Design a protein around this ligand. Structure first.
Ligand SMILES: CC(C)(NC(=O)O[C@@H]1CN2CCC1CC2)c1csc(-c2ccc(F)c(O)c2)n1
Ligand SMILES: Nc1ncnc2c1ncn2[C@@H]1O[C@H](CSCC[C@H](N)C(=O)O)[C@@H](O)[C@H]1O
Length: 220
């Protein structure tokens, strides 16, 4: 109901991200000062599955969805995992990632340039599949199909993490960058509709009151 034709929905957002500077501040819509707050909370939220316990999550390989120039790949994933794959729809950001990442960018194993609605991660490949601030660009059915494909790419004890914006009441339409913001209910329905289990749900604090609410979901 909030998407009249899907072809124009994707084509408008892809054009939007072509004209965005490959800087950290451009990845977050002009909020690059919160990158340190985000990464550190994502670091804590990720130890829940990395520390000792019954079902320890591996550290062999990870997949960053959205990624951009590698803001999360550089600060969060590359320190913790041996190899990291990146996937994005904007080729410019992946090219600029080779510079932004630096010496450690040599451990980035693959750069995929295509949309999540068309991306199929290899099975039995990743210990962590990080999906941050990008789900608002997919349709409700493509997001469920994508999460269904990610489940088959997880290694034993692997997890899927979704950290994106959540609306307070209703679906908020942002035609500035061609994205939809959803509430916790529709997201959890889509998550459950892919056959995934809720393992943890945490809300990011220490955030400006102008941006949306941000929640993290741990799935497998
Ligand atoms: C940092 C954050 C969370 N700000 C925010 O709250 O939104 C703001 C409202 N307005 C749009 C996005 C900024 C600036 C202008 C942000 C930046 S870019 C982004 C996003 C976009 C599209 C997506 F599909 C997605 O998953 C995520 N979120
Ligand atoms: N339909 C789509 N399929 C795959 N990636 C998309 C997409 N629409 C937007 N993106 C990517 O999602 C990012 C939007 S915000 C980038 C957030 C980034 N993942 C981070 O580390 O914080 C852009 O890099 C854009 O190229």
């Amino acid at each position: 109901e909030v998407i009249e034709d899907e072809k124009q929905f994707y084509s408008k957002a892809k054009t939007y991200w072509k004209q965005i500077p490959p800087t950290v501040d451009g990845m977050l819509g002009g909020y690059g000062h919160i990158s340190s707050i985000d990464i550190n909370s994502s670091r804590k939220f990720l130890q829940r599955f990395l520390r000792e316990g019954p079902n320890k999550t591996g550290t062999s390989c990870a997949l960053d969805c959205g990624a951009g120039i590698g803001r999360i790949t550089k600060r969060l994933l590359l320190p913790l995992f041996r190899e990291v794959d990146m996937v994005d729809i904007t080729e410019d950001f992946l090219v600029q990632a080779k510079t932004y990442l630096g010496e450690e960018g040599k451990r980035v194993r693959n750069y995929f340039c295509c949309g999540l609605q068309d991306f199929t991660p290899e099975p039995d490949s990743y210990d962590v599949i990080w999906i941050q601030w990008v789900i608002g660009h997919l349709t409700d059915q493509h997001l469920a199909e994508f999460l269904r494909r990610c489940k088959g790419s997880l290694r034993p004890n692997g997890i899927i993490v979704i950290k994106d914006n959540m609306a307070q009441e209703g679906v908020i339409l942002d035609d500035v960058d061609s994205s939809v913001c959803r509430d916790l209910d529709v997201v959890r329905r889509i998550i459950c509709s892919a056959g995934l289990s809720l393992l943890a749900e945490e809300r990011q604090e220490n955030l400006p009151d102008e941006i949306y609410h941000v929640y993290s979901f741990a799935l497998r």
